[PDB]
Short mmCIF file of N, CA and C in Angstrom, two decimals:
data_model
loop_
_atom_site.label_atom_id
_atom_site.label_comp_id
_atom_site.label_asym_id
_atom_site.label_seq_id
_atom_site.Cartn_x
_atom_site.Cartn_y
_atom_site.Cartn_z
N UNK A 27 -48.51 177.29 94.57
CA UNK A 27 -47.37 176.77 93.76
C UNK A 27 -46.08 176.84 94.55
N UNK A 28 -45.08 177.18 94.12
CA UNK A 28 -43.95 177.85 94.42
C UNK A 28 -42.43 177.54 94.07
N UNK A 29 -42.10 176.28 94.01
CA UNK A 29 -41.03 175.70 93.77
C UNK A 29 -41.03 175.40 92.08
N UNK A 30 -39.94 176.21 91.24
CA UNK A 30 -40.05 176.29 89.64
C UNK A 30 -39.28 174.82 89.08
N UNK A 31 -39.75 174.26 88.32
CA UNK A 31 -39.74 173.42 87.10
C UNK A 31 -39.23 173.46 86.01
N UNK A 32 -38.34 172.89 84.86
CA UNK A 32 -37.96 172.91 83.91
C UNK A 32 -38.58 172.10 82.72
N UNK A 33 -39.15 172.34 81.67
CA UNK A 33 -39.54 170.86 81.38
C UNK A 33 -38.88 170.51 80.44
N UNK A 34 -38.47 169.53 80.75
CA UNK A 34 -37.13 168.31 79.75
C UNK A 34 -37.45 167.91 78.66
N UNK A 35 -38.79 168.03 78.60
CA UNK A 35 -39.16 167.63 77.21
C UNK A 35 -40.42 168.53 76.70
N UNK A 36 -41.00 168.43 75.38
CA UNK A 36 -42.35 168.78 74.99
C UNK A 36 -43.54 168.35 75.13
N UNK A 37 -43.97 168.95 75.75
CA UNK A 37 -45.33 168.25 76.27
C UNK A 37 -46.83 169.09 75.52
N UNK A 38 -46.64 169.01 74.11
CA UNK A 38 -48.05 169.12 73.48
C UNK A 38 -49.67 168.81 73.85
N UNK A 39 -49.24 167.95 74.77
CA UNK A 39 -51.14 167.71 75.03
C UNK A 39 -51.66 167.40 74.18
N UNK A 40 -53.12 167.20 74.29
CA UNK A 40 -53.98 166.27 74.18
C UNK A 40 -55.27 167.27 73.35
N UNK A 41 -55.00 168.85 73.71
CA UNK A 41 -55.95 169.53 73.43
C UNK A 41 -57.15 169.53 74.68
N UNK A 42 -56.88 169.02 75.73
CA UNK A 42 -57.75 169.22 76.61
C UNK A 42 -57.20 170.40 77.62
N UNK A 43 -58.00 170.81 78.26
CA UNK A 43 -58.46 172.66 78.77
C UNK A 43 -57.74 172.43 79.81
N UNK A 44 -57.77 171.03 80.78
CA UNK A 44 -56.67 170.66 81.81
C UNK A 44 -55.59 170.75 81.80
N UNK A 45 -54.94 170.45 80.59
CA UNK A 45 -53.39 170.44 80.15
C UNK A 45 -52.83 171.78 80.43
N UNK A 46 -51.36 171.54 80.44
CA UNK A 46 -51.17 172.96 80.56
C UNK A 46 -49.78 172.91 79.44
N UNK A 47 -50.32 172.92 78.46
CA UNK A 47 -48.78 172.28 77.03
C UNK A 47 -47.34 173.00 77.29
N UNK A 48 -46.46 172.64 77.22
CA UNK A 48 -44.99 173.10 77.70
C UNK A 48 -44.10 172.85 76.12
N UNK A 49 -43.23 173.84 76.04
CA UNK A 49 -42.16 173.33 75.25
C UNK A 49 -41.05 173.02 76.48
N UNK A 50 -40.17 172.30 75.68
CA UNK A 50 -38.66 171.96 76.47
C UNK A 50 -38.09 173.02 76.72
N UNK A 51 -37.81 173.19 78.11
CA UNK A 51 -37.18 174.91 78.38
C UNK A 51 -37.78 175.57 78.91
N UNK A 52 -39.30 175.48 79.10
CA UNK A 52 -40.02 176.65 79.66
C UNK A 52 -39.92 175.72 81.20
N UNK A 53 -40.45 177.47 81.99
CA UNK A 53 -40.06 177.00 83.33
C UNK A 53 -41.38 177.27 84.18
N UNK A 54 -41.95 176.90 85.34
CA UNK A 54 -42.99 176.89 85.92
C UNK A 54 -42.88 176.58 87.22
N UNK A 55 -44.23 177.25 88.14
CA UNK A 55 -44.50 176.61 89.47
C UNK A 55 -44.78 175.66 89.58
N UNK A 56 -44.67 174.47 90.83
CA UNK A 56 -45.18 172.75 90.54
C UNK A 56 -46.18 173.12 91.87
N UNK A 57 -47.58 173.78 91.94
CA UNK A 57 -48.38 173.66 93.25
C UNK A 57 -48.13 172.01 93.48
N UNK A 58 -48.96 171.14 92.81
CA UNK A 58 -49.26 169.43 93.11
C UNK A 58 -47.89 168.57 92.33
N UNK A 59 -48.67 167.53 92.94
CA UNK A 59 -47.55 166.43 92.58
C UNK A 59 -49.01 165.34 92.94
N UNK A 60 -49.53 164.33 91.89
CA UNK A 60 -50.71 163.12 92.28
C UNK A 60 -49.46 161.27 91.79
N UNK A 61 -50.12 160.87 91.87
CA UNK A 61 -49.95 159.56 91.93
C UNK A 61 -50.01 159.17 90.90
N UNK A 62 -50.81 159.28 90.18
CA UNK A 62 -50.93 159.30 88.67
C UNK A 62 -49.78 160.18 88.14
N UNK A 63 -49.16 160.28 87.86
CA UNK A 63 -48.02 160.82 87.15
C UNK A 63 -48.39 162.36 87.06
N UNK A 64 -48.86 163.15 87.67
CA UNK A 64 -49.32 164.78 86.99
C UNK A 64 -48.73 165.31 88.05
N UNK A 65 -48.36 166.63 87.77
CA UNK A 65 -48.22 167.63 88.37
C UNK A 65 -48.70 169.04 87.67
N UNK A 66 -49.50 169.97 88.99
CA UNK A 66 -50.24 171.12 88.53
C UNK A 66 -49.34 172.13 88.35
N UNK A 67 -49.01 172.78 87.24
CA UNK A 67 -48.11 173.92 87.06
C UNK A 67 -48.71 175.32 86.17
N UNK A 68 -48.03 175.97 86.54
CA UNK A 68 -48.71 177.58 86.94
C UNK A 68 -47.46 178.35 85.91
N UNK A 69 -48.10 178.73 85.12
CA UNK A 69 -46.81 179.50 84.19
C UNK A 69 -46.42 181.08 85.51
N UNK A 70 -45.36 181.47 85.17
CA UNK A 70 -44.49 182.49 86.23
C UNK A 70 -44.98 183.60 85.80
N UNK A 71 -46.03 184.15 85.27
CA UNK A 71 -46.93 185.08 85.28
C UNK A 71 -48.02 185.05 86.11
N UNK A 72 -48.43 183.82 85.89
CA UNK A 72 -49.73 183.70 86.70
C UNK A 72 -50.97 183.33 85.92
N UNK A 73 -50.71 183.49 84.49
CA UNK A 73 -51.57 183.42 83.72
C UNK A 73 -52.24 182.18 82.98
N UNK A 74 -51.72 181.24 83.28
CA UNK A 74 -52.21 180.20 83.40
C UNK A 74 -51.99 178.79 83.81
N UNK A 75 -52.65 178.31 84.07
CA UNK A 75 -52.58 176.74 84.89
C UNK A 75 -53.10 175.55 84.39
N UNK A 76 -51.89 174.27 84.47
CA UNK A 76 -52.86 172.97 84.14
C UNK A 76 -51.66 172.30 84.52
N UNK A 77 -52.44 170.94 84.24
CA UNK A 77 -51.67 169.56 84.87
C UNK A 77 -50.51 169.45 83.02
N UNK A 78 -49.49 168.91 83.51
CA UNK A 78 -48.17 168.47 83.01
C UNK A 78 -47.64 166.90 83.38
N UNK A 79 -47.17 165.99 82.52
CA UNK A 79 -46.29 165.15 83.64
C UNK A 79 -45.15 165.42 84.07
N UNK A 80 -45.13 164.98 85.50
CA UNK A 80 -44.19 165.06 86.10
C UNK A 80 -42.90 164.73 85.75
N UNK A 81 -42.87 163.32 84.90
CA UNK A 81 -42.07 162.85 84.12
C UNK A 81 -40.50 163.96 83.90
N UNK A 82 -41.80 164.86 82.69
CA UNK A 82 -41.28 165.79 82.02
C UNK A 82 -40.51 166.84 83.35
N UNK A 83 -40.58 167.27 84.07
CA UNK A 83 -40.74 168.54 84.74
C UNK A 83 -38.77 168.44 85.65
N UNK A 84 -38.28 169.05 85.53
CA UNK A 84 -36.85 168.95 86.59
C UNK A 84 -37.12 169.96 86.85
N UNK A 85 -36.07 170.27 88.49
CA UNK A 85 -35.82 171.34 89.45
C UNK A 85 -35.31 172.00 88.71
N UNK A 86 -35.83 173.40 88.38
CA UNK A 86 -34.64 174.61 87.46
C UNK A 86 -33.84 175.47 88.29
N UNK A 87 -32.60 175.47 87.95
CA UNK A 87 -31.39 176.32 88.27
C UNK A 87 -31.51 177.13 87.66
N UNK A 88 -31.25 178.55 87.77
CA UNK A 88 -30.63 179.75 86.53
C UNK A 88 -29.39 179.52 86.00
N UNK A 89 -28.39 178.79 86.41
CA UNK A 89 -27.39 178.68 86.17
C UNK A 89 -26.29 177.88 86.43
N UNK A 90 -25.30 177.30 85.86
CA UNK A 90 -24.32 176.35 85.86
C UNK A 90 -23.13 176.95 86.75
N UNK A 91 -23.04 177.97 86.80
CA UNK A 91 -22.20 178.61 87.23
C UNK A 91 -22.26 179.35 88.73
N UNK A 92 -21.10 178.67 89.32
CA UNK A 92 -20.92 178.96 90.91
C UNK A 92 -20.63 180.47 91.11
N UNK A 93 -20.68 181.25 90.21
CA UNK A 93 -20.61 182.81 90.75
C UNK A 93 -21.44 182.94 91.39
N UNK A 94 -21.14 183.82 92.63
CA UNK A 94 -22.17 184.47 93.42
C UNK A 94 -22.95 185.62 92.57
N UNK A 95 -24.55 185.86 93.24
CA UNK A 95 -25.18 186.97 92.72
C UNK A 95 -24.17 188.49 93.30
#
């Protein structure tokens, strides 16, 4: 995986075991990126994995704000 995800929207699925269902807001690893519109994402535990669209998925920031850590 490695690079985290936002997803912009809700992505309920289909009920299939591949999916990996997202609400808007949750954040994730993107391992893949296919041609077909999917990308494989990995919740930030580790605990589970499935394809998402990409569609859905933006680069997540922690924050709006230019303060340094």
């Amino acid at each position: 995986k490695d690079p985290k995800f936002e997803a912009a929207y809700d992505f309920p699925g289909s009920g299939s075991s591949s999916e990996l269902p997202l609400k808007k807001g949750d954040i994730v690893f993107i391992s893949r990126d296919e041609p077909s519109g999917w990308s494989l994402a990995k919740l930030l535990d580790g605990s589970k994995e499935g394809w998402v669209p990409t569609a859905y998925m933006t680069p997540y920031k922690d924050t709006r704000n230019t303060v340094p850590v």
